[PDB]
Design a protein around this ligand. Structure first.
Ligand SMILES: N[C@@H](CCC(=O)N[C@@H](CS)C(=O)NCC(=O)O)C(=O)O
Ligand code: NA
Length: 201
């Protein structure tokens, strides 16, 4: 009612918003969008996000906010999930831009190729390159989480939420997280939050 999400629960970018809404106890309606079925290419959808992607968060007055990581900032602002100190707020945004530039296009797309398309031969060379670049991003996270328990110091924030969404299913794109015990112990910490919800119910 206060919030309406247009989304697909299987999409890591949309899972970020399901998780944030539940962690904050905020009420929502979920409108399932079928991207293969054409739902993001209609004019009705493009009026909500001209970039043609989910998730979209629609507010009570009809205003539509898009980009999953910008939606996390809107929901979290003033909460314990988004620091107000400029250096710490900047570090949270650093991990979020890093997630959109250096991580998502390798982790999410490898998972699409393998889980959604069954790893076709025609995409195998592409897939192996995504593996090399995705592992490079997991290596960055492993070094940080070998030193602090969340990406930004001692406090769970929307940087962790942004990176947990696809990292927790990186095995579905053929990444072997047993190589990353610091990532695995962080996934455990995220998942231990008393209001945590899984991607699928
Ligand atoms: N940078 C966007 C990416 C969102 C995105 O790539 N959504 C995919 C599903 S995970 C999508 O809507 N694809 C539809 C299309 O491109 O036609 C965000 O983080 O919200
Ligand atoms: Na985003």
């Amino acid at each position: 009612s206060l919030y309406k999400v247009y989304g697909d629960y299987r999409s890591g970018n949309c899972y970020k918003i399901k998780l944030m809404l539940n962690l904050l106890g905020l009420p929502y309606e979920w409108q399932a969008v079928d991207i293969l079925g054409g739902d993001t290419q209609t004019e009705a959808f493009l009026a909500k996000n001209p970039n043609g992607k989910i998730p979209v968060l629609e507010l009570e007055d009809g205003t539509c906010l898009w980009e999953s990581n910008a939606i996390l900032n809107f929901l979290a602002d003033g909460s314990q999930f988004l620091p107000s100190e400029p250096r710490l707020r900047t570090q949270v945004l650093q991990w979020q831009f890093f997630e959109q530039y250096s991580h998502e296009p390798y982790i999410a797309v490898a998972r699409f190729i393998q889980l959604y398309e069954g790893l076709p031969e025609e995409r195998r060379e592409e897939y192996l390159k995504l593996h090399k670049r995705g592992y490079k991003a997991l290596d960055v996270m492993e070094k940080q989480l070998s030193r602090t328990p969340y990406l930004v110091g001692e406090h769970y924030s929307i940087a962790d939420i942004a990176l947990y969404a696809y990292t927790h299913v990186a095995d579905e794109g053929g990444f072997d997280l047993s190589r990353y015990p610091g990532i695995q112990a962080w996934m455990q910490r995220v998942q231990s939050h008393p209001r945590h919800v899984p991607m699928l119910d």
